[PDB]
């Protein structure tokens, strides 16, 4: 699907931005930065929190911007891929 | 859009109320109070929990009143604003 | 509203059940048990986790049963109360 | 219902996969592995985070694949089963 493709690409770019930011500013390992971005944007959350004020401000903006996109991608993956394969 | 503007203003006022409350009652720094309000209303959560009973009661009420508004704002941002990707 | 009334009553009974359970089995203070039930059923989550296996099993069942009801109540409070008052 | 049964079976299989994985890779007790899978897929979250990189990668993928199915099961339970309250 085309819109699923654009949602996938935007989700990947968002997770890449989060990885880069949290590895630079918060000094996380790249895998830890990626995990934090993922559990944050899916609203799972973890015991980790940003320590710098820049990290906290960016996390607020990142949450507000990326929750909608990550969950649009999850919803489209569920409704246009997972449902037909289940029907099979 | 107008409804988007109402939702933005209400979200800002809700986060301001949360910031003021958690900086007064829970003694958090204002940036920390804002971060806690944001991660609470978006259901992300963090390792911080209110220590006073007043903080806990206010958080229960704050969750129930503000989750709907915050996620309405996120949805309207993602749909009525976050679609310039249609310029694909 | 009638269905809003039944959703409110069911949410109150669910939070009461959670308060009683987590104050007895997990030894929490009643306010702490109520706060844990609230942040759990709204998927906010907190740093607290049940220590007993009974608490963990009950929490799994409680999550699955009460997320749908708590969020039906939140959705109805947003759509049948908050929206018209906003329009005013 | 039949779709409810498919969703229940898929949810059980997903939680079983999560239990097995988190008990092997992360060394959790089986009850703890099941609890972590449940609170992760429902987006509640807990103070536990995977310690191995394999655990983190698997959790990212597990979140993205299972959130849709788990919440479809919760919705179908709450709507097609949790309405005997209509006997009001
Ligand atoms: Ba959620
Ligand atoms: Ba948490
Ligand atoms: Rb959540
Ligand atoms: Rb959470």
Numbering used by the authors:
A (entry chain A), B (entry chain B), C (entry chain A), D (entry chain B): 21 to 108
Question: What did the original publication write about this model?
Answer:
Ionotropic glutamate receptors are cation-permeable ion channels responsible for fast excitatory signal transmission in vertebrate neurons. In the α-amino-3-hydroxy-5-methyl-4-isoxazolepropionic acid receptor (AMPAR), the permeability for calcium depends exquisitely on its composition. To this aim, we investigate calcium permeation in two cation channels: The AMPA receptor GluA2 and an AMPAR channel pore mimic that incorporates the partial selectivity filter (SF) sequence of AMPAR into a bacterial NaK channel. We used the prokaryotic NaK channel as scaffold for crystallization, as in our previous study of monovalent cations.
The X-ray structures revealed distinct ion binding profiles for monovalent and divalent cations within and around the SF. The monovalent cations bind at sites S3 and S4 in the lower part of the SF formed by TTV. This is consistent with previous X-ray analysis of a NaK C-DI mutant with monovalent cations only. While monovalent cations prefer binding sites at a narrow pore, i.e., the TTV filter in NaK C-DI48 and the QQ filter in AMPAR,23 Ca2+ ions occupy more sites along the SF with substantial presence also at the wide CDI part in both NaK C-DI and AMPAR. Indeed, in NaK C-DI calcium and barium reside stably at a single site within the wide section of the selectivity filter, which shows in contrast no occupancy by monovalent ions in the presence of divalent ions.
